Amino acid sequence: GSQEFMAVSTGVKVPRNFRLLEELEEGQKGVGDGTVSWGLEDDEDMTLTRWTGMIIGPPRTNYENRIYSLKVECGPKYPEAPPSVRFVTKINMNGINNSSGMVDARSIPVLAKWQNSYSIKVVLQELRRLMMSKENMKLPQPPEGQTYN
Amino acid sequence: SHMQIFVKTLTGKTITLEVEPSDTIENVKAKIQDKEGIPPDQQRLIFAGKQLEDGRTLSDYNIQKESTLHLVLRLRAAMASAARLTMMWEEVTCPICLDPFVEPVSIECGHSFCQECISQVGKGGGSVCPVCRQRFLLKNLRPNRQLANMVNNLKEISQE
Amino acid sequence: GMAGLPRRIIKETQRLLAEPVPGIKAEPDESNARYFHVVIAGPQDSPFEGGTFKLELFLPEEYPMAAPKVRFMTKIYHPNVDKLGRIKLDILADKWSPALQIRTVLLSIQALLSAPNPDDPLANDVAEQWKTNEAQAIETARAWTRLYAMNNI
Amino acid sequence: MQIFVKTLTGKTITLEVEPSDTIENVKAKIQDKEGIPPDQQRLIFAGKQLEDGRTLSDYNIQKESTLHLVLRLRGG
Ligand SMILES: [Zn+2]
Ligand SMILES: [Zn+2]
């Protein structure tokens, strides 16, 4: 038949809000190296939809010392559906539309091959590790402190 | 061809069921069990001034689409005595698993649980009682066989 | 893929539908039997009286060996409840008992509304106000209750 | 008088009290029947956590009034 017996079953269905409440606590607890940070944009949004992230530029790269603010949006299907990603500080990186900050999910593997195992922390950590790569490590950058509108 | 009917509780909750005119009353009580968790023994269905019997069909009682049924919970009044026999099941219910005791054992304070249920609580050799929070050690588990004999007595009573 | 829902959750769900508690409402989600949508009444003789407070509750994989996850979906002025509805209550953490149920967890949450504790707070900015002028904080809790917890259902 | 008290598992028990009997007086009858120490009992009526000092009619607890038992709890 279509279904077969399995001895072990793990991983219950966690509702979207409680998954997002867990990601909120990890960002508030400063979990990680410190080169990334994530949290809510408006701390009254009960829907936990609009988020804001931070990324420090890696050393041995072109983005060194540069603080990058980001905005992330987790839709009603998160974490099944992927979240929308954007850049608040203007940047030059392969895979981002140049006048928007909106991220092409295609040109980034974490958002292209999206899972439910992925967190907002990973979308930020691997984006900084994506900025570590050879092609954009030597990209020219605009004056730090200028943004879109 | 499935059709929709409604089963409203006296509490106010309305249930939507996908049923057939050929469904017996017991078939509906099984569909209520899967969706509401309520066993069929504790169900008494009402429709248009009549109490419905498990052997007859919805068509026998002229229950068509969008008909509204009333679910009453344990409407009848005795198998020995309704509330009192119920109190007997509650006395042999494990506070952890909420099922009748399986290998019931007691801890120091005197409260009793399923052996496996309280063993999981006391992983490492001990913990606190789930009922009164007194410390207990698994080495002091004490079998409570009268509770187990009581369970089989009540189970035999249920199946007459 | 699929596995049987634990019998204890089945029992609790059926007894929430058969023996409801006055002032407390809990209903499972259509897409998730571990996900509950809750409305609790504010306790009598508290600044939250007359209010209807919405919560959501989730039974994690380890339940009942672990406490349920529960938070307010209604804005409320309380030192042990932050601005996103998260609750810091000992029976939801270190003092959890596997003998507690959804019914008694929700009864304990409205018992927390009748006994705020600004000395050990979750929302320190709220608690600082509860300690500076408790009479004003009670009035503010009463005003927040009418503003956010009345005609909200 | 008669009062119902819903225990932790959900089982309901009947008790013998008076309008004058204190809250801890009710807890003693609960302790004899259920073995929960009074310092670990918390009785709820109309959502308010009862304090051991006052009496039943201080809370307007008539006959056939159902109380709800809960473990000791603290906000943090
Ligand atoms: Zn058990
Ligand atoms: Zn005990």
Numbering used by the authors:
A (entry chain A): -4 to 144
B (entry chain B): -1 to 158
C (entry chain C): 0 to 152
D (entry chain D): 1 to 76
Text from the published report:
Ubiquitin chains that are linked via lysine 63 (K63) are involved in endocytosis, DNA damage, and the immune response. The only E2 enzyme dedicated to K63-ubiquitination is Ube2N (Ubc13), which forms a heterodimer with either Ube2V2 (Mms2) or Ube2V1 (Uev1). Ube2V2 binds and orients the acceptor ubiquitin, thereby generating specificity for K63 linkage. TRIM21 detects antibody-coated viruses by specifically recognizing the bound antibody.
In crystallization trials, we used N-terminally mono-ubiquitinated TRIM21 RING domain (UbG75/76A-TRIM211–85 or Ub-R), an isopeptide-linked, non-hydrolyzable ubiquitin-charged Ube2N conjugate (Ube2N~Ub) and Ube2V2. We solved the atomic structure of this complex at 2.2 Å resolution, with one copy each of Ub-R, Ube2N~Ub and Ube2V2 in the asymmetric unit. The naturally occurring TRIM21 RING homodimer was generated in our model by invoking crystal symmetry. The Ube2N-charged ubiquitin can be found in the RING-promoted closed Ube2N~Ub conformation and thus represents the donor ubiquitin. The RING-bound ubiquitin of a symmetry-related complex was captured by Ube2N/Ube2V2, positioning its nucleophilic K63 NζH3 group 4.8 Å from the electrophilic carbonyl of the donor ubiquitin C-terminus. Interestingly, K63 of this acceptor ubiquitin shows a direct interaction with D119 of Ube2N. This suggests that D119 deprotonates K63 on the acceptor ubiquitin, thereby activating it for nucleophilic attack. In our crystal structure, one RING dimer is positioned so as to mediate the elongation of another mono-ubiquitinated RING in trans. Importantly, this mechanism depends only on binding of the RING-anchored acceptor ubiquitin to Ube2N/Ube2V2, as no contacts with the RING itself could be observed in our crystal structure. In our structure, it is clear that initiation of TRIM21-anchored chain elongation cannot occur in cis, as the priming ubiquitin cannot reach the Ube2N/Ube2V2 binding surface.
